[PDB]
């Protein structure tokens, strides 16, 4: 029936922000009941026309508003209109229930009319101007923008973001690109690059806060991602150029900030690793060159500088770079490259000097002779030496030198604190192979055996600088003794050689007692007692004839004796004059290097014979690879040596 | 009954008479109203002529 | 007088590398230790 | 056991009436019709095809 | 076939064959190797373990490197590994420790650690070979440290297996036992500790071994408030043993140190400290022999530090004691001891600062130490100079103006440090900091004759490539330029010769792009300071510096420093910055609204005050542009306390306040005390604001008393300075008003006598409609300026009524005339509550 | 107490509870009831089995707008497409002429199973009008382009034995193989694949109307 | 929890807002009231019908108790189930439709006029399969 003149005033009043009395409301809803009594598909069109007319009138009311005045119109009206639509929903909820082939949906679609109306452009411009002012620093309330965002999101068929996207997202992002691109250029032109990273981080945090503050979360990713394009990726070249600049000078905090800023992008960390390795290598070589010749003959200085640079870069990578596996791998590779072969090695025409000097540095460090013993700090130095030794490609030289040096040290009573030595040997056993420990533990046990045996001679003397150390010479790295009969003054002591060691079933070390009466004043000097032994005889040339020792070593003894004042006195009785011969050091070093080379040659021969024990006959392409992968732990061989060994084995009729 | 099976199969079963289907098919293989009464009424199996 | 001394075996086994290899090539099974390698 | 029939598909002959075993009855489901040779897994051995157009009228054995 | 072929091929009685079998099985197992048969897994584990102890060492050497993981079967592996270390075989025993260490090093399973610990408890028993003892001790210490909670069951067994071998001949075993015992003590069953404590107490009665005292000291480190009882019995023993002439006395010092720091009630200070002093200077006595004596010295130093860092109630006489004299007697012992002695002295100095007075003692001891310091500047070591500079800065900071006489003998050291050996950046930065702090608080008339020697180094050091060097040198430069021509006093020394160097040095660094932010901030600060101080002479280059300042003002990062510098340029030597030159920048300055950085209006007013030749030019000055941005800045008391006085000043010097109607309207009308009555001078220059304060009677709805009092106050202030007088003011006209239309009319007259500096409702106040506060203020303001009194003669007696409140008012304000009479105050005690004696406390 | 002045949805709710026999008996009462007797909301799952209907009834039911219905074990001896999304004509041979006459045009049948029916070629491709079907048949049924619509044949000849799994869209979940698998070219318990049943509910959609 | 309801005849009822909230028709608008169509007795019946279904969140078997409430006189019955849609509950309408179908089910169409109020042959021929 024609009772349409009652819903009119109802919606007109509900269109206002003032509430409506519930008592009289039955006059409206019940009237809708009359419509569906005694369908029709006629009311939808009439209500659509009414909504269109009301919305057109509302648009005409405030058409001219803009420049923050429109923004107070759309938002102001939408709250009231949404409340009115929600209230009216229940009026025709009956139809909405029984009409499915939508009143709130119709209201939203009609709202789309004013949305796509001239209001769209000016409203979007005002919103973007508000964002721009917020970026500048001026504070503005964010309630109205939240209302506008809710307006843009709600429209649709988070049900659908198509209209919201097409109407706000593209233009917001475009404004962002132009703003950031415009500002970054002259900011970098005038302001320093060091604080650019901090400003970028602060800006990114500001956007990441704004998005939840007064924006839909659906744009969480895109807004961030493209904002990396304008800020970070587009300016990657200047960042790369300045990485070296601000890495040369300690800026570790800036290093961490830069790493955090640049890690967001895809494949951004890779390039900086190259520069890191290059700079580490260059700085290491520069430091080694600055050390120069002094580094070659002074292991302490060279190893100290190497450990200092290693510690500095290790701390830097562990702190700034958050302990990334790629970064530590790059550091390890650079350390290997610039510590295996460097300037100091070039003077020795060999790459084995760097590992060799480490053994001498260790021996000097843990020696109790120089000034004094150090505890609670020597352990850290030993651990750092272990760390730096982990890199060494040629580990055979270190072990070979250390075995001989430890044997020489432990033959005499000279030894540092037992705790540090025990820790060092335990660490070496844990890190190195069994074969070396099987040899070192033999010395460790045999010295205790000798210590226990020492009392036997004293007790035998009682029953019937004096401690005869006895240990089997078969397995230790030493050499034979010279031919020189002991004089009468010392003959009686060794005449009682029989003991458990001998009764049950070497001497080339000049030791003796200091009792001389030839000179007017007596002295007490422990030294190489070859001169002391010769003194028992007494011309200058007469001494050699009676002793008839081999001319080479005897002449060397004479020269070293003449170096002193004994033959042609000191401040105190504490005098040693026990300087080791210079030539013997170089001769022994050359001999041990030759022995190591021979041992490696024999090892590679045995290794090829063993690997072919499982391979009947095969090619050469995989032979070298299998050889290297089976011997990578120790010093790696050289191709010509392998070829010569293979030729010799072929001559041996082993393979084909 | 093995000797004779009622064509319908129960009232007057003996009188009605004169796998059960196989036994009864002898007469049919080598017609009347009320065919669509028992569940056995179906043209899937060959029962013509 | 404090110095170092040593004691060594008696019967012992030792041979040159070339002779060692030649002996290993055919004597690996003839005796059971105490005279080889 | 099985019991072959005399003549049931004279118009198009591929098999005849057969008996039903105790084990075969369990494997014979009502949901799946009597396929010609889909019962080979469930102990089926008879003339080629043996397409059953229907099922037992009174009850299947 | 191939899957299980390796296990069968393993048994070959050959060297190369077994070597290669081990190699390829290990290489294959290194891969993921998915779907391995359980029986095959058992085969491989059994065969690897069986080969573990074969011949041909290389084979077992490679075998022992087997990967830790492939957890039912790992139990068998660990059981086999631990059961071998105690076997008769030597090589197998040695390899068992390595295998156990390798397998147990698989932590990210707890049953495994329980089983291994329970099986390994007994292995510490005395054995002929001590090689495995160290490994067992280390691995057990590792398990105990990593996981101590799960060992709750078998604690006493570990205790009893760990004590007996403490006296093993090998020193390494002893040391490892000390650390293991410390760890197990840290693990804590209260009973566990008592055994150790009593055993060590009894065993130390007669023994020459020093490890007992070492472990006694060590255990207390971890025992937090758990060894208090032991102290009473052990302190005598340690003090007695201190006299023993053992090769090292350090252990007793460490014991006393740790017990003192960790235990609060150690109530015997004098003995330990005295023995520290005795043993501090125990000097006693290349290929020479060892020398560990120095140790004791440093130990003593450290312990001294502890006491001077712990006690906070023993400051008075500590300086008078022999401690500081001994410390300063000989500071030249060797490299290491110097650091610890300097640290102890620094700790004492730090404890001196609160945040016969003790300081006097130090004030008397400053010379000697200074003397002792003067030599150490020549030491080649850098740490010595660093420590000396740290001590000097701490001494200067703790008490101001301590080194007011020895500057001539101290400056040479600083200049030497700055001049040479520039490689050590720490030395240079510390020296510059020391120079800045010593120059911070001293009379200007001390550094004069040394300026000629100090300026060059600094000006040469400003250009150092290292940025921290400049970041410390520019502050010293600012202090120096400040200490040349102080404004308070006249400086005889001429400043012209040296200002050129400073000006050029700072200006060169001011303009650049590779400089740091802090360096730029401090450079602009120093430039502003120098320009304000002695910019008159440097007038030739002034315009370019001002232009650079204007250019730098734009940068967002550097705004506060430039604003502070511009504000600071207000010295008595009027700094003429040409009026247009500041004019083009004034619009930029006024545009600032950056989130609560309001040094803005604290500098604009100074700039327009010192230079006021032209300020009313609206196009290029304030009163139109700056005023437009004054609405938000008058809304919240804190910032508006300063905002309002801006308009106050603008009104006086002027066209004064031509367009401020909106500002005045908004300013009208919670507020704690902020009053702008002194700022209401617009009336004098232009009752201009008549109704703004008399709006009460017409408009009174939604009003707060806090603002009503201010309204009455401003009415009084407007009546303060004008042709009108209080006798004809708003209160005067409304003299007798009993038909008040509303409460606002009553509040208007509530404070009527305030307009002072008897004819209205003359004594009708106590007939209060609601109440009254200070209406009878005529007496107070009339006693002093006018005659002695107007109504005080018959004030109280006429009206018996709670009118005693007025009493507290009459004597509150003035005291010169407050009590010439003394009758009513004393002759009557006023019977009415404490209000009677509200003012009696302070008449 | 008049019962002739009620809305339409109320009568729909009344009818929604009725079963088949009672509903069809109530179909004719008065003119008003006749219009609401046949409505879209009513007929959505209609399963009559073994009723050997006549073409007029099925034509009317299809034209009435039956959303989806199955019809197993029903023999038939004796256009405007409707939403018949689910269909089941299995193991019940019917006259090919009538099948072509009525099944000439179907707009969309998401489920169309014809299991055990002899129809020749000229009408097999006419199903291409369907938007897309995801169900096939293997019970004795253009040869290659039919399955392109969506992306045990004794009479089947040898040529198209290898065509199926050689050059055809394979996005379908599965392609059942049986009987013809042995003869399939190489160059190219129970089974519950491509079947309607594994409880009158069929194809996973409950039959809201079953005669039984 | 006190809302006043008025019927057409003019009687005021009070119900705490825990049971009348079930009827969505009256609840939807109350979120943001003299009902003219409903009768006072029917209003009482609908108000009291919510006694059992408080705990339960919002042909075939139905609750046995419901029969006593559904065994109601025709005079009140027709008014109740013709005005229910105004304040129908999601369960009340379902049970109503079920019971009315149950009355209709099993009867004879030719005599349906006795209860509620050429073409017969054509209708029968239209659907003869059943």
Curated annotation (Swiss-Prot), chain A:
Reported tissue expression: Expressed in lung fibroblasts.
Superkingdom as given in the UniProt entry: Eukaryota
Keyword Coiled coil: no
A single GO molecular function term of this UniProt record: ubiquitin protein ligase binding
Cross-link (Glycyl lysine isopeptide (Lys-Gly) (interchain with G-Cter in NEDD8)): 613
One Gene Ontology term from the biological process aspect of the record: G1/S transition of mitotic cell cycle
Pathway(s) of this molecule: Protein modification; protein ubiquitination
Modification after translation: Neddylated; which enhances the ubiquitination activity of SCF. Neddylation prevents binding of the inhibitor CAND1. Neddylation leads to structural rearrangment in the complex that allows interaction between the E2 ubiquitin-conjugating enzyme and the acceptor ubiquitin. Deneddylated via its interaction with the COP9 signalosome (CSN) complex. (Microbial infection) Deneddylated by Epstein-Barr virus BPLF1 leading to a S-phase-like environment that is required for efficient replication of the viral genome.
GO cellular component: cullin-RING ubiquitin ligase complex; cytoplasm; cytosol; nucleoplasm; nucleus; Parkin-FBXW7-Cul1 ubiquitin ligase complex; plasma membrane; SCF ubiquitin ligase complex
Keywords from the UniProt entry: Host-virus interaction, Isopeptide bond, Methylation, Ubl conjugation, Ubl conjugation pathway
Domain Cullin neddylation: 599-656
InterPro entries (UniProt xref): Cullin (IPR045093), Cullin_CS (IPR016157), Cullin_homology (IPR016158), Cullin_homology_sf (IPR036317), Cullin_N (IPR001373), Cullin_neddylation_domain (IPR019559), Cullin_repeat-like_dom_sf (IPR016159), WH-like_DNA-bd_sf (IPR036388)
Keyword Nucleus annotated: no
Family in the record: Belongs to the cullin family.
Record protein name field: Cullin-1
Organism annotation: Homo sapiens (Human)
Gene: CUL1
UniProtKB/Swiss-Prot annotation, chain C:
Record's subcellular location: Cytoplasm; Nucleus
Binding site for Zn(2+) 2: 18
Tissue: Widely expressed.
Residues that coordinate or bind Zn(2+) 1: 16, 19
Origin: domain of life: Eukaryota
UniProt: Zn(2+) 3 binding residues: 11, 13, 30, 33
Domain notes: The RING-type zinc finger domain is essential for ubiquitin ligase activity. It coordinates an additional third zinc ion.
Subunit structure of this chain's protein: Component of multiple Cul1-RING E3 ubiquitin-protein ligase complexes commonly known as SCF (SKP1-CUL1-F-box) complexes, consisting of CUL1, SKP1, RBX1 and a variable F-box domain-containing protein. Part of a SCF(SKP2) complex consisting of CUL1, RBX1, SKP1 and SKP2. Part of a SCF(FBXO3) complex consisting of CUL1, FBXO3, RBX1 and SKP1; this complex interacts with PML via FBXO3. Component of the SCF(Cyclin F) complex consisting of CUL1, RBX1, SKP1 and CCNF. Identified in a SCF E3 ubiquitin ligase complex together with HINT1 and CDC34.
Role summary: E3 ubiquitin ligase component of multiple cullin-RING-based E3 ubiquitin-protein ligase (CRLs) complexes which mediate the ubiquitination and subsequent proteasomal degradation of target proteins, including proteins involved in cell cycle progression, signal transduction, transcription and transcription-coupled nucleotide excision repair. CRLs complexes and ARIH1 collaborate in tandem to mediate ubiquitination of target proteins, ARIH1 mediating addition of the first ubiquitin on CRLs targets.
Name of the gene: RBX1
Residues of the full protein shown: 27 to 101 of 108
Curated annotation (Swiss-Prot), chain D:
Coiled coil: none
GO-annotated molecular function: cyclin-dependent protein serine/threonine kinase activator activity; histone binding; protein kinase binding; ubiquitin binding
Keywords for this protein: Acetylation, Cell cycle, Cell division
Keyword Acetylation assigned: yes
GO cellular component term, pick one: SCF ubiquitin ligase complex
Signal sequence coordinates: none
Organism superkingdom: Eukaryota
Gene Ontology BP term (one): regulation of mitotic cell cycle
Function, in words: Binds to the catalytic subunit of the cyclin dependent kinases and is essential for their biological function.
Family statement drawn from the similarity comment of this UniProt entry: Belongs to the CKS family.
Subunit-structure text: Forms a homohexamer that can probably bind six kinase subunits.
Protein's recorded name: Cyclin-dependent kinases regulatory subunit 1
Organism: Homo sapiens
UniProtKB/Swiss-Prot annotation, chain F:
Pathway(s) annotated for this protein in UniProt: Protein modification; protein ubiquitination
Modifications after synthesis and translation: Phosphorylated on serine and threonine resudues in response to DNA damage, promoting 'Lys-63'-linked ubiquitination of NBN. Ubiquitinated by the APC/C complex, leading to its degradation by the proteasome. Deubiquitinated by USP13.
GO biological process terms, semicolon-separated: cellular response to cell-matrix adhesion; defense response to virus; G1/S transition of mitotic cell cycle; G2/M transition of mitotic cell cycle; innate immune response; positive regulation of double-strand break repair via homologous recombination; positive regulation of intracellular estrogen receptor signaling pathway; positive regulation of protein polyubiquitination
Predominant cellular place of this UniProt entry's protein: cytoplasm
Ranges occupied by LRR repeats: 57-78, 79-105, 111-135, 136-151, 152-171, 173-188
Localization annotation: Cytoplasm; Nucleus
Keywords: Acetylation, Antiviral defense, Cytoplasm, Host-virus interaction, Immunity, Innate immunity, Leucine-rich repeat, Nucleus, Phosphoprotein, Repeat, Ubl conjugation, Ubl conjugation pathway
Domain F-box: 1-46
GO cellular component: cytosol; nucleolus; nucleoplasm; nucleus; SCF ubiquitin ligase complex
Phosphoserine, modified sites: 80
GO molecular function terms listed in the Swiss-Prot or TrEMBL record: identical protein binding; ubiquitin-like ligase-substrate adaptor activity
Region: Mediates interaction with IFI27, residue numbers: 199-212
Protein known as: S-phase kinase-associated protein 2
Whole sequence portion shown: 95 to 419 of 424
């Amino acid at each position: 029936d024609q009772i349409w003149d009652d819903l009119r005033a109802g919606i007109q009043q509900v269109y206002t922000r003032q509430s409506m009395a519930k008592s009289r409301y039955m006059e409206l809803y019940t009237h809708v009941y009359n419509y569906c009594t005694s369908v029709g598909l006629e009311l939808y069109k009439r209500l659509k026309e009414f909504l269109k007319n009301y919305l057109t009138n509302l648009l005409k009311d405030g058409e001219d508003l803009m420049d923050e005045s429109v923004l107070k119109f759309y938002t102001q009206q939408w709250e009231d209109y949404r409340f009115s639509s929600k209230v009216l929903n229940g009026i025709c909820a009956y139809l909405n229930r029984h009409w499915v082939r939508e009143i709130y949906s119709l209201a939203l679609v009609t709202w789309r009319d004013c949305l796509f109306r001239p209001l769209n452009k000016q409203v979007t411009n005002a919103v973007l101007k508000l964002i721009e002012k917020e970026r500048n620093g001026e504070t503005i309330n964010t309630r109205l923008i939240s209302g506008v965002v809710q307006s843009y999101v709600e429209l649709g068929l988070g049900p659908t973001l198509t209209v919201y996207k097409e109407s706000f997202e593209s233009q917001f992002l475009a404004d962002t690109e132009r703003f950031y691109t415009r500002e970054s250029t002259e900011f970098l032109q005038q302001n320093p690059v060091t604080e650019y990273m901090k400003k970028a981080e602060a800006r990114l945090l500001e956007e990441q806060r704004r998005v939840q503050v007064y924006l839909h979360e659906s744009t969480q990713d895109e807004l961030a991602r493209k904002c990396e394009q304008v800020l970070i990726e587009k300016h990657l070249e200047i960042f790369h150029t300045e990485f070296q600049n601000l890495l040369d000078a300690d800026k570790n905090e800036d290093l961490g900030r830069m790493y955090n800023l640049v890690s967001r992008i895809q494949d951004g960390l890779g390039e900086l690793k190259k520069l890191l390795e290059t700079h580490i290598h260059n700085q290491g070589l520069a430091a080694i060159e600055k050390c120069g010749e002094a580094a070659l003959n002074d292991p302490k200085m060279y190893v100290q500088t190497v450990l200092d640079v290693h510690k500095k870069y290790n701390a830097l990578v562990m702190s700034a770079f958050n302990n990334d596996a790629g970064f530590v791998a790059a550091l390890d590779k650079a350390c290997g490259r610039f510590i295996n072969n460097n300037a100091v090695t070039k003077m020795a025409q060999s790459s084995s000097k760097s590992p060799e000097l480490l053994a001498r540095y260790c021996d000097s460090l843990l020696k109790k002779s120089s000034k004094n013993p150090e505890e609670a700090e020597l352990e850290d130095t030993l651990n750092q030496v272990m760390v730096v030794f982990k890199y060494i490609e040629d580990k055979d030289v270190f072990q070979k030198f250390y075995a001989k040096m430890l044997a020489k040290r432990l033959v005499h009573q000279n030894s540092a604190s037992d705790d540090a030595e025990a820790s060092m040997i335990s660490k070496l056993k844990q890190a190195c192979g069994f074969e070396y420990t099987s040899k070192l533990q033999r010395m460790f046990q045999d010295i205790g055996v000798s210590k226990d045996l020492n009392e036997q001679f004293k007790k035998h003397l009682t029953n019937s600088d004096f401690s005869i150390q006895v240990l089997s010479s078969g397995s230790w790295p030493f050499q034979q003794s010279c031919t020189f009969a002991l004089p009468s003054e010392l003959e009686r002591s060794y005449q009682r050689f029989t003991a458990f060691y001998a009764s049950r079933h070497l001497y080339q070390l000049s030791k003796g007692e200091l009792v001389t009466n030839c000179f007017k004043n007596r002295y007490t000097l422990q030294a190489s007692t070859f001169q002391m032994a010769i003194l028992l005889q007494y011309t200058v040339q007469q001494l050699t004839d009676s002793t008839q020792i081999k001319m080479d070593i005897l002449a060397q003894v004479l020269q070293i004796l003449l170096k002193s004042k004994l033959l042609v006195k000191n401040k105190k009785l504490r005098v040693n004059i026990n300087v080791p011969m210079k030539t013997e050091q170089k001769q022994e070093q050359e001999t041990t290097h030759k022995n190591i080379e021979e041992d490696r040659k024999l090892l590679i021969q045995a290794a090829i014979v063993r690997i072919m024990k499982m391979r009947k006959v095969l090619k050469h392409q995989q032979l070298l690879g299998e050889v290297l992968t089976q011997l990578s732990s120790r010093f790696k061989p050289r191709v010509p040596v392998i070829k010569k060994c293979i030729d010799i084995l072929i001559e041996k009729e082993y393979l084909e | 009954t093995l000797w004779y099976r009622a064509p319908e199969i129960y009232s007057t079963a003996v009188d009605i008479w004169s796998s059960e289907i196989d036994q009864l098919f002898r007469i049919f293989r080598t017609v009347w109203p009320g065919v669509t009464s028992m569940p056995d009424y179906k043209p899937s199996f060959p029962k013509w002529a | 007088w404090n110095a170092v001394a040593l004691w060594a075996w008696v019967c012992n086994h030792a041979f040159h590398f070339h002779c060692i290899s030649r002996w290993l090539k055919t004597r690996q099974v003839c005796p059971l230790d105490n005279r080889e390698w | 056991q099985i019991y072959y029939s005399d003549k049931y598909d004279d118009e198009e002959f591929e098999y005849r009436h057969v008996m039903l075993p105790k084990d075969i009855a369990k494997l014979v489901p009502k949901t799946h019709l009597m396929s010609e040779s889909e019962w080979r897994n469930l102990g089926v051995q008879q003339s080629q095809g043996w397409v059953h157009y229907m099922i037992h009228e009174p009850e299947p054995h | 076939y191939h899957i299980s072929n390796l296990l069968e091929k393993m048994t070959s009685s050959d060297k190369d064959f077994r070597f290669m079998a081990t190699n390829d099985l290990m290489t294959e197992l290194q891969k993921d190797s998915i779907k391995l048969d359980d029986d095959s897994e058992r085969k491989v584990v059994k065969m690897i373990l069986k080969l573990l102890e074969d011949k041909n060492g290389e084979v077992q050497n490679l075998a022992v490197k087997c990967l830790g993981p492939l957890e039912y079967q790992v139990e068998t592996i660990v059981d086999t590994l631990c059961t071998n270390m105690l076997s008769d075989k030597e090589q197998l025993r040695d390899i068992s420790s390595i295998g156990l260490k390798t397998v147990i090093g698989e932590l990210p399973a707890a049953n495994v650690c329980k089983k291994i610990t329970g099986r390994l408890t007994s292995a510490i028993a005395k054995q002929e070979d001590v090689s495995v003892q160290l490994e067992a001790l280390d691995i057990m210490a590792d398990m105990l440290s990593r996981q101590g909670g799960l060992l709750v069951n078998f604690h006493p067994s570990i205790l009893t297996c760990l004590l007996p071998q403490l006296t093993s001949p090998r020193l390494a075993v002893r040391k490892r036992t000390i650390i293991a015992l410390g760890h197990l003590v840290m693990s804590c069953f209260v009973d566990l500790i008592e055994h150790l404590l009593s055993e060590l107490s009894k065993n130390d009665s007669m023994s020459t071994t020093r490890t007992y005292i070492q472990c006694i000291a060590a255990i207390s480190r971890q025992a937090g408030h758990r060894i208090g009882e032991y102290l009473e019995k052990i302190i005598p023993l340690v003090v007695k043993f201190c006299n023993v002439d053992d090769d090292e006395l350090r252990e007793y010092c460490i014991q006393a140190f740790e017990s003192f720091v960790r235990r609060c009630p150690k109530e015997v200070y004098p003995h330990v400290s005295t023995i520290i002093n005795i043993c501090l200077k125990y000097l006693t006595y290349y290929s020479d022999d060892d020398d560990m004596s120095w140790k004791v010295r440093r130990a003593a130093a450290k312990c001294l530090d502890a006491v001077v860092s712990t006690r906070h109630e023993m400051l008075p006489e500590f300086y008078k004691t022999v401690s500081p004299a001994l410390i300063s007697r000989f500071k030249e012992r060797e490299e290491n001891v110097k650091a610890d002695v300097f640290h102890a002295y620094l700790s004492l100095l730090k404890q001196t600062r609160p945040v016969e007075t003790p300081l006097t003692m130090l004030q008397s001891q400053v010379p000697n130490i200074v003397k002792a310091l003067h030599k150490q500047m020549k030491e080649k070591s850098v740490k010595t100079r660093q420590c000396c500079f740290n001590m000097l800065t701490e001494l200067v900071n703790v008490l101001p103006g301590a080194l007011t006489q020895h500057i001539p003998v101290l400056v040479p050291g600083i200049i030497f440090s700055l001049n040479d050996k520039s490689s050590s950046s720490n030395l240079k930065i510390d020296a510059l900091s020391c120079l800045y702090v010593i120059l911070c608080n001293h009379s200007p008339q001390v550094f004069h004759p040394h300026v000629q020697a100090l300026v060059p180094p600094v000006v040469a050091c400003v250009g150092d490539p290292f940025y921290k060097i400049t970041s410390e040198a520019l502050l010293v430069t600012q202090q120096l330029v400040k200490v040349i021509r102080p404004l308070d006093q006249p400086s005889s020394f001429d400043a012209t010769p040296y200002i050129k160097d400073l000006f050029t040095c700072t200006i060169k660094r001011l303009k650049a792009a590779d400089i740091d932010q802090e360096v730029k901030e401090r450079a602009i600060s120093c430039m502003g300071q120098i320009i304000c101080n002695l910019g008159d002479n440097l007038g030739s280059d002034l315009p370019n510096t001002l232009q650079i300042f204007l250019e730098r003002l734009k940068n967002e990062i550097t705004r506060l420093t430039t604003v502070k510098a511009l504000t600071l340029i207000a010295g008595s030597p009027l700094k003429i910055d040409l009026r247009p030159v500041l004019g083009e920048g004034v619009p930029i300055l006024a545009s600032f609204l950056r989130k609560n950085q309001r040094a803005l209006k604290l500098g604009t007013l100074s700039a327009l005050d010192i230079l006021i030749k032209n300020y009313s030019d609206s196009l290029t000055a304030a009163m139109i542009d700056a005023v437009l941005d004054e609405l938000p800045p008058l809304i919240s008391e804190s910032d508006m306390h300063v905002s309002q006085m801006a308009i106050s000043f603008l009104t006086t010097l002027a066209i004064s306040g031509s367009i401020l109607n909106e500002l005045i309207g908004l300013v009208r009308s919670l507020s704690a005390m902020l009053d702008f009555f002194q700022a209401l001078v617009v009336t004098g220059t232009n009752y201009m604001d008549l109704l703004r304060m008399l709006t009460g009677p017409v408009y009174s709805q939604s009003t707060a008393l806090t603002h009503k009092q201010s309204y009455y106050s401003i009415a009084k202030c407007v009546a303060a300075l004008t042709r009108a007088c209080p006798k004809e003011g708003p209160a005067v006209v409304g003299q007798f008003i009993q038909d008040v239309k509303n409460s606002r009319s009553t509040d208007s007259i509530r404070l009527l006598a305030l307009l002072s500096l008897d004819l209205s409702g003359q004594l009708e106040l106590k007939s209060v409609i609601l109440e009254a506060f200070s209406s009878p203020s005529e007496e107070v303001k009339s006693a002093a300026s006018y005659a002695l009194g107007s109504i005080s003669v018959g004030n109280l007696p006429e009206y018996l009524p709670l009118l005693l409140h007025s009493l507290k008012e009459i004597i509150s304000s003035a005291s010169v005339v407050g009590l010439k009479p003394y009758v009513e105050n004393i002759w009557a005690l006023l019977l009415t509550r404490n209000v009677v004696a509200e003012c009696l406390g302070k008449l | 107490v008049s019962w002739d002045s009620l809305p339409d949805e109320l009568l729909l709710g009344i009818f929604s509870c009725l079963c088949l026999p009672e509903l069809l008996k109530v179909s004719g009462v008065c003119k008003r009831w006749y219009r609401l007797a046949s409505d879209e909301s009513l007929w959505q799952t209609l399963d009559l089995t073994g009723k050997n209907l006549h073409p007029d009834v099925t034509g009317r039911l299809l034209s009435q707008g039956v959303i989806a219905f199955r019809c197993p074990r029903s023999f038939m001896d004796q256009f405007s497409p409707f939403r018949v999304q689910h269909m089941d004509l299995s193991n019940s041979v019917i006259e090919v002429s009538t099948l072509h006459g009525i099944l000439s045009q179907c707009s969309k049948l998401q489920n169309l199973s014809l299991e055990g029916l002899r129809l020749s070629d000229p009408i097999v491709n006419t199903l291409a009008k369907n938007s897309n079907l995801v169900r096939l048949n293997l019970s004795g049924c253009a040869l290659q382009t039919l399955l392109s619509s969506c992306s045990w044949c004794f009479d089947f000849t040898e040529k198209h034995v290898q065509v199926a799994v050689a050059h055809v869209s394979e996005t379908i979940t599965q392609l059942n193989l049986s009987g013809y698998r042995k003869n399939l070219q190489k160059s190219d318990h129970f089974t519950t694949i491509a079947r309607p049943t594994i409880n009158q509910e069929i194809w996973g959609i409950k039959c809201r109307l079953t005669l039984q | 929890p006190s809302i006043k309801l008025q019927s057409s005849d003019g009687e005021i009822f009070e119900v705490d807002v825990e049971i009348a909230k079930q009827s969505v028709t009256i609840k939807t608008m109350l979120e943001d009231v003299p009902l003219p169509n409903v009768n006072a007795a029917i209003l009482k019946k609908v108000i009291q019908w919510c006694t059992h279904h408080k705990d339960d969140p919002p042909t075939d078997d139905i609750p046995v108790w419901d029969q006593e409430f559904l065994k109601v006189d025709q005079g009140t019955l027709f008014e109740l189930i013709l005005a229910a849609n105004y304040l129908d509950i999601k369960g009340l309408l379902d049970v109503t439709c079920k019971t009315v179908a149950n009355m209709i089910k099993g009867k004879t169409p030719e005599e349906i006029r006795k209860t509620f109020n050429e073409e017969e042959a054509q209708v029968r021929k239209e659907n003869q399969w059943c």
